[PDB]
Amino acid sequence: ESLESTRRMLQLVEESKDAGIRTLVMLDEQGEQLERIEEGMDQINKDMKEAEKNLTDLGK
Amino acid sequence: RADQLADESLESTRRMLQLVEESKDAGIRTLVMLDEQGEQLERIEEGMDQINKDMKEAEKNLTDLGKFAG
Amino acid sequence: GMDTSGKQAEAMALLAEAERKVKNSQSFFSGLFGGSSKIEEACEIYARAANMFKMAKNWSAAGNAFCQAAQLHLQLQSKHDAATCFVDAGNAFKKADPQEAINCLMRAIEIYTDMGRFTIAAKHHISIAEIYETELVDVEKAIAHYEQSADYYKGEESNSSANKCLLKVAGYAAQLEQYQKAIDIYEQVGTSAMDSPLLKYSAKDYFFKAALCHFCIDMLNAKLAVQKYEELFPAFSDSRECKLMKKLLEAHEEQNVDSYTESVKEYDSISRLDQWLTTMLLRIKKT
Amino acid sequence: GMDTSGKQAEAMALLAEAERKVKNSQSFFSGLFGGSSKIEEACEIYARAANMFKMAKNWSAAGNAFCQAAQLHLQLQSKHDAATCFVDAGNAFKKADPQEAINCLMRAIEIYTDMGRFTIAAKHHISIAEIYETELVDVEKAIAHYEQSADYYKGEESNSSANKCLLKVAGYAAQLEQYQKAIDIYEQVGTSAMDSPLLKYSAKDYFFKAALCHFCIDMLNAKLAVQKYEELFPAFSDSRECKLMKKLLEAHEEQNVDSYTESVKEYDSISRLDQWLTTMLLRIKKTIQ
Amino acid sequence: GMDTSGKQAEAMALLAEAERKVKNSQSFFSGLFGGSSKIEEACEIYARAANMFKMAKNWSAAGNAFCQAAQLHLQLQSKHDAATCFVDAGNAFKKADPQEAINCLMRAIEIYTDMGRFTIAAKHHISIAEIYETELVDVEKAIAHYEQSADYYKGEESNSSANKCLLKVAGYAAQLEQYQKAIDIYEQVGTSAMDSPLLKYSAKDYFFKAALCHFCIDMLNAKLAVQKYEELFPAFSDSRECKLMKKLLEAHEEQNVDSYTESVKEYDSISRLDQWLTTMLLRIKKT
Amino acid sequence: GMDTSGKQAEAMALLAEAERKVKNSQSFFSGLFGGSSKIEEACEIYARAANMFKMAKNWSAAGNAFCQAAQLHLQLQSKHDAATCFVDAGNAFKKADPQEAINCLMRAIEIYTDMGRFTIAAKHHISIAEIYETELVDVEKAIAHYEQSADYYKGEESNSSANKCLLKVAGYAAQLEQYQKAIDIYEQVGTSAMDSPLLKYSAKDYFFKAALCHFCIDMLNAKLAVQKYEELFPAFSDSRECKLMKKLLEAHEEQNVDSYTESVKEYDSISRLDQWLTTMLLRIKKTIQ
Amino acid sequence: EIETRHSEIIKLENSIRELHDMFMDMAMLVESQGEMIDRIEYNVEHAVDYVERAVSDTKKAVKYQ
C-alpha cells in the first residue's frame, strides 16, 4: 500500500512541477509587459501636462 | 540494520513534514496576495476608461466649437 | 429580444437615412459644403446601426455596417478610427464568414505598419495565423505570418513572445518534416532559456526535442549531438530524458523491437504522452 | 460623535444651500435664461453634499442626493455623468436599502447598452445578480442575469468569465431545475476545457458532476454517459471518481443500502464531501426502493 | 560628491534668484499690475529648487521649499498642485525630521477628503499610522489611524483592504491587554472567511487565535468558544490545532504544568512560533 | 527583397528632401519669417524617414536621423520629445555602435534627472550597466551604475529594486573586489528580511554567503561571525548549511584535505552546485598547506 | 514507529491533494489577469495615439490662427 502511495506521490509532485514551471513563465511575461505599459503611461502624462499648460499659457 | 532504517525514517518524516508546511504557508500567502492586485487593476480599468471617454468627448466638442468660431 | 429585432429593423432604417446622408453628398452638400460634420454624424449613425445589429446577433449585417462606416470615414482623415472600424468588422466576421475578416485585418496591418505600431500589427498577424489554423488548413501562410510577427517582436527586444512563436513554428515544421529549421530554433531557444535563472528548468525539454529531431535524420551523428548537449550542460544527463534517449539509441544498434518498446511503455507508465511525441516516435522507430 | 455632529451640521447647511440652488433653478428656467450653468453649479454642490453625506455614514441621504443630482443632470443633454451618478447612487444604496439600487442600476445598464460598452454592462449585470442572490431570496432572476452576463461575455470573446458564469448558473440550476441544462452546460464546459491545457486537469470534476446528474434521473442513461465520457476521455478511466461511480452503480443495481452507505462513507473519509454532493447523494439514495 | 557640491552651489544661487523673484514680482504687481504669471514662475522656481535640493541630498530644505511652494500655490487659489507639493514635502521629511511631515500629511488628507476622494486619504492615513508605529510608541494614534483607514476602505466596499487594517488593530489591541476588540475582530474576519473560495483554507487560523485570546479570561469560556467554533466549522477538528488546544485545556485543568510545557515545546519543534504567540502562551502559563 | 530596396531608396529621397527643406527653412526665416513650422515639419520628415529606415532593418543611419531630429527639436526649446528620441536612438544603436548608444543614453539620463524623474533615470542606469558588462568586459563602471540605480530607487522607497541591485553589486565585488563591502551588504540585506511577508525563510542563504566571505578572510573571523549569527538567528542553528560549514571548519582545522574533499563531494551529491560557491571553495582549498 | 509512518503518509496525501487544488486556482486566476492586462494594453496604446494626434492637430489649428 505504501508502494502505490509513493507512486501517487511521484505522479502528483511531477505534475505540480510541470504546471508550475508554466505558471512562472506566465508571471514573467506579465512582469515583462508591465514596464512597457508604465513607460507609455508616463510618456502620455508628460505630453498631456506640457501640451495643456502650453495651450493655457497661449490663451492669455 | 534496523538502526539506519529508523534513522533515515525519522529524517524522512521530519523533512517531509517541514517541507510540506513551508510549501503550504508559501502557497496560501501568495494566493491571498493575488486578490489585491486583482481589484487594483480592476479599478485602473474603470479610471482609465473614464479618462478615455471624457477626453474623447472634450476634444470632439472643442473641434466643433473651433469650426463654429472659424 | 423580438422588439430588439424590430429595432434592428429600424436600424436598417438608420442605415437608410445614412443613405439619405450620402444622397446629401450627391446633391445637397452643394449648399451644405461645410457639413463635413454632417458626414461625421452620418458615420456615427452608421457605427451605431452596426452596434445595434451586433447586439441583434446579425453578424453579416454588423460586419457590412462596420465595413461601410470604415470606408466612409477613411476620407484620408481620422485613419486610426478607420483602422478601429476595420478591426471591429474583422472581429464581427470572425464568426460566421471570416474570409473578408482576413482582408480587412491585412488593411489594418498595412495602416499600422505605415504608422509603425508593430505590437498591434504582430498580434493581428497571430490572430490571422490562428484563424487560418483553426478554420482553414493552410499552414504555410500561418508559418509566414508567425515569422513576420516574431521578427517584429524581436525588433523591439520582446524576446519571450518571439521565442514562443518560434517554438510553435518549429513544432509545425517538424510536423512538416523540415528538421534543419526545427533543430536550429530549438537549440536557439534552449541555449537562450538556459541563460537566465528564471527559465533554466525548461532547457531539458527543448534539448530533448532538438535531440529527437537531430536523431531523426542521421543515427550516427545523434550520439555526437547528445554528447555535445551533455558536455555543454553537465546537468542534462541526470534528466530522465537523456537516459531514455541513450537507451533508445544504444538499443537501435541491435535489431530488437522489444528493447525500445518496453522502454517507451515504461516511460509512458510514469506520465502520458502527447500526439506530437507519440506520432514522431511511431514514424521514426519504424526504421 | 462630535466629528459626526459637526459633519451632520454642515450637511444640513449644504442641504439648505442646495434647496436655495433648486430655487435658483426654477427661477432661471421660468424667470431667467441661461440657467443651465446655474443648475450645473447646483449639480456641483449637490455632488459635494452627497459625497459628504457618504462620509457622514448617512447612506440613505447620500443615495437620495445622488439620485436627485443625477435626475436633474439628465435634462442637460448629457448622458455619461448621468451614468456615473446613477452608478454612485446604486453603490450607496447597495447597503441599507438595495431595492431601488436595482432599479437605478438597470437604468445605468440601459444607458450603457444604448451607448455600446458591453463589458461594463456585463460586470454590472453580474453585480446585480450577486446582490440579488445574497440579499433577495429568489433565484430565477439570478439564472436570467447570469445568462445575460454570460451572453455578453462570450459575445465579446472574453471566454474565461463567460465559462465561469455558465458553470455557476448551470450548477445552481442543477439543484432546483431540470438537469438537462445542467448536463448540457457541464458537458460544454468540460469539452471546451479538454483541449485547453489550463483546465484539462480539472475537467474531470465537471465530467463527474455530469455523471451524477445523469444518475440522479436514471441508471442506464448514466451508464451510457459514463462509458461515452471515458471513451472520449481515456484518462478518465483511471480516475478514482470512475471507480467510485462504478462501485456506487453496481451497489445500486443490487439494492443494498449498507454497501452504498459504507462506500460513500469511505469516500468521505478521504478528502471531504460538499453540501451539494451530499444533497445529491441523499436525494439519489432516498429513491432506492 | 562633486556633483552634490555643485548642485548645492547653484541651489543657493537659485534660492537667491527665487527670493529676488518673489520680492520684485510683488513690487511689479504693486507698481504695474502685470497679473499673476510672475507668481506662477516663482512657484516653478521653488519647485525646481526643491527638486535639485533633493538631488543635492538635503531633505529638510527640500521639504521646506516644497511647503513654501505649496502654500504660495494654494494662496494662488489652486489645490491639486498644492496637495502634490504638500505630499512631496511630507515624503522629503519622512526621513530626517518626520514630525512636520505628520502635519503636512494631515493637511493633504484634509484637502483630499474635503474634495471627496477617499482611497488616497486612507493610504495617507495608513502611512501616518506606520510612521507613528515605526518611529514612536504612541500606539493609540496608530490604532486610531488604522481604524479610520479601515472604515474608509470598508465604506468604499474594499473589503480586502479593510481586513488587513482590522487584523492589525486586533493584534495591537490584544497586545495591550484588551481582548474584547480582538475577539470581535478575529471572530468577524473568521466568519467572513467561511465562504471565500480561496481564503477558506486559512479561515481556521484566525479562529485559533481567538480561542487562545479567549482563554486569557477563564477555562469554561474557552471550552464553550472552541466547541462553538468547531460546530460552526466542522473541519476545524481536522487540524492539529484543535488537538493542541484540547491538550492545553486538559493539562491546565489538573495543574499539569510539565506536560503543558513539553507539548508546547514539541509544537515549537515541529514548527517554530513567533514572539506574539510565545508571549501569549507564557502569559497564559503564568496561572 | 523589393520591400527593403524600396524602403532604402525612399529613405535616401526623404533624407535629401529633409536636408533641402531645412536649408530652405533657413532661407525662408529671413525671407518670409514664417515662425518655426518649417523646422517642425522638417523634424517630422526626419522622424518618418528614420522610423521607416529602422523598419528597412538598417539601424545606424536610423539612429543617426533620430539624433539629428532630436537635436534640431531641442534647438526649439523642446526637451522631453528630444529626450525620448534620444532614448529611441540609443536603443537603435544598441545593435549598431555601443559608444554612441551609451552617449545618447547618458544624455537622456542627465536630462531626465534634471526634469525630476528618478525611476526612469535608474532604469536607464541599469540598462547602461547591462550593455556595458554584457559585451564590454569591465565591472567597476557597472558597479557604479548599479549603485546609482539602487540609490535612486531607495530615494523613492523602492526597496525591492534597490535590494536586488545591492545584492548584485555585493556578489560582483565578492567575486573581484574586496570582501568587507560584500560582508556588509550581504549581512544587511539578509537581516533586513527577518520579518519578510513571503521570504521569512530566505535570509539564511545570505548569511551562509556572508559566512563564506568571512571564512575567505580568516578562520577566527569565520568562527566568531558564525557564532554571532548562531545567537542572532536561532533557525540558522538547524540549517543544513550550518552543519556543512561546521564540518568544513573542523576538517580544515586539522589539515586533512581528504575530509574537506569528501565533505564537498557529499554536499554536491545531495545538492547541485551554483558555480559561485565552487570557485570560493576551490580558493579556500588552495590554502590548506 | 510504523503507526507514526501511517499517520505521516495520510497527512502527506492530504497535503499533496490540497496543494494540487491551490495550484489549479493559482493558474486560473493568473490566466484571467493576463487576458485583462492585455485588453488594458490595447486600450492604453490607442489612447496614446489618439491623444498625441489630438495635441498635434490642436497646435496646428492654433498656428493657423
mmCIF file of C-alpha atoms in Angstrom, chain E residues 54 111 117 121 129 142 164 177 188-189 208 212 218 238 251 263 270 280 285:
data_model
loop_
_atom_site.group_PDB
_atom_site.id
_atom_site.type_symbol
_atom_site.label_atom_id
_atom_site.label_comp_id
_atom_site.label_asym_id
_atom_site.label_seq_id
_atom_site.Cartn_x
_atom_site.Cartn_y
_atom_site.Cartn_z
ATOM 1 C CA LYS E 54 16.698 66.627 -3.244
ATOM 2 C CA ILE E 111 -7.842 68.773 1.414
ATOM 3 C CA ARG E 117 -11.608 61.333 -2.788
ATOM 4 C CA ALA E 121 -6.867 59.648 2.068
ATOM 5 C CA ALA E 129 -0.036 55.167 11.207
ATOM 6 C CA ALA E 142 -1.692 54.134 15.233
ATOM 7 C CA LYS E 164 -5.655 43.971 6.888
ATOM 8 C CA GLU E 177 -4.238 43.514 27.380
ATOM 9 C CA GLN E 188 -15.750 38.535 12.474
ATOM 10 C CA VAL E 189 -12.921 38.014 9.986
ATOM 11 C CA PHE E 208 -7.442 29.578 16.579
ATOM 12 C CA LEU E 212 -6.161 31.486 22.660
ATOM 13 C CA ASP E 218 -11.116 31.667 32.068
ATOM 14 C CA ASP E 238 -9.144 18.090 11.423
ATOM 15 C CA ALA E 251 -3.124 19.899 31.129
ATOM 16 C CA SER E 263 3.519 19.741 24.451
ATOM 17 C CA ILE E 270 7.709 20.640 14.561
ATOM 18 C CA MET E 280 0.616 34.869 24.872
ATOM 19 C CA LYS E 285 1.027 29.677 31.696
#
